[PDB]
Design a protein around this ligand. Structure first.
Ligand SMILES: *[C@@H]1O[C@H](CO)[C@@H](O[C@@H]2O[C@H](CO)[C@@H](O)[C@H](O)[C@H]2NC(C)=O)[C@H](O)[C@H]1NC(C)=O
Lengths: 48, 48
């Protein structure tokens, strides 16, 4: 029995699938109230 | 519709009377997508 399980032996030259790969995740389900992130929406030159 | 809209005007007073005679319309200052529910309000005074 243990509470944790040990943090990994992160040795570089051994680590192949076993080295630390930092990861990030985006979630954006909408279905709520206002607008908050609405893309770059670029602008073309003004013709006259 | 989720938004809270502030309109305002700052008019000079000849020191004549309250809410002087004349006309002046309030411009929209901020137009804020707060998104919540309002049913009551109150004001802050400062004390030194
Ligand atoms: C803002 O809050 C009030 C108060 O909770 C909501 O009024 C309720 O509305 C529901 C749905 O119609 C009623 O069943 C309750 O009886 C209401 N409560 C009271 C005390 O009146 C109101 O719907 C809310 N507004 C928004 C836009 O969510």
């Amino acid at each position: 029995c243990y509470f944790p399980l040990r943090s990994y032996g992160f040795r570089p030259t051994y680590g192949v699938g076993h080295q630390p790969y930092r990861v990030v995740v985006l979630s954006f389900e909408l279905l709520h109230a206002p607008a908050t992130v609405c893309g770059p929406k670029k602008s073309t030159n003004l013709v006259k | 519709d989720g938004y809270f809209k502030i309109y305002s005007k700052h008019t000079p007073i000849n020191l004549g009377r309250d809410l002087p005679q004349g006309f002046s319309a309030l411009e929209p200052l901020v137009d804020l997508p707060i998104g919540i529910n309002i049913t009551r309000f109150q004001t802050l005074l400062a004390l030194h």
